[PDB]
Design a protein around this ligand. Structure first.
Ligand code: V0Z
Length: 164
């Protein structure tokens, strides 16, 4: 079935717990596969050790820039960027997992977990999964954001991988 992956997240070096994400490979297989492999690190790079560098309360928590750790970087398992696979899944509410981008067809590795419905991102960001477990962790992460996105704690994906 669809991959289940996990992010174990620290804030200021103490574990918040685990976010478990279902990757909707049945809808966006290429996008799901990218994220899955970045979680396992099996291509030799990925999210382990990277940060939630942009967190906006009542919006989303964004992570995945494992190259520059600041929102300018990241890369996919396919190359630096890959196309928007489709926009079929919508930003329906908290827990939606969606690809950050810098315009059309600029998916890399950065992603965000919504903490609200973000319908204006429909058709602009490829949704590719959702939180199965650990919304409490997401809410913790969110609580360390700010309007500017700057985090008030260092939020680190200390471990990540695939559960199934
Ligand atoms: C809009 C934005 C991004 C972003 O989405 N960047 C981006 C996404 C995907 C790819 N492939 C390359 C760059 C990352 N960090 C921050 C901080 C901030 O205040 N805004 N912001």
């Amino acid at each position: 079935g669809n991959p289940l992956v996990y992010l174990d997240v620290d804030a200021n070096g103490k574990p918040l717990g685990r976010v478990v994400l279902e990757l909707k490979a049945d809808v966006v297989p290429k996008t799901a596969e990218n994220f899955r492999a970045l979680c396992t690190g099996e291509k030799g790079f990925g999210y382990k050790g990277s940060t939630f560098h942009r967190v906006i309360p009542s919006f989303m928590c964004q992570a995945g820039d494992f190259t520059n750790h600041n929102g300018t970087g990241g890369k996919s398992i396919y190359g630096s960027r890959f196309p928007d696979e489709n926009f079929t899944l919508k930003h329906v509410g908290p827990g939606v997992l969606s690809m950050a981008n810098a315009g059309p067809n600029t998916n890399g590795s950065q992603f965000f977990i919504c903490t609200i419905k973000t319908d204006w991102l429909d058709g602009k960001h490829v949704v590719f999964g959702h939180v199965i477990e650990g919304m409490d962790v997401v809410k913790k992460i969110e609580s360390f954001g700010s309007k500017s996105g700057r985090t008030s704690k260092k939020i680190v994906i200390t471990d990540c991988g695939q559960l199934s």
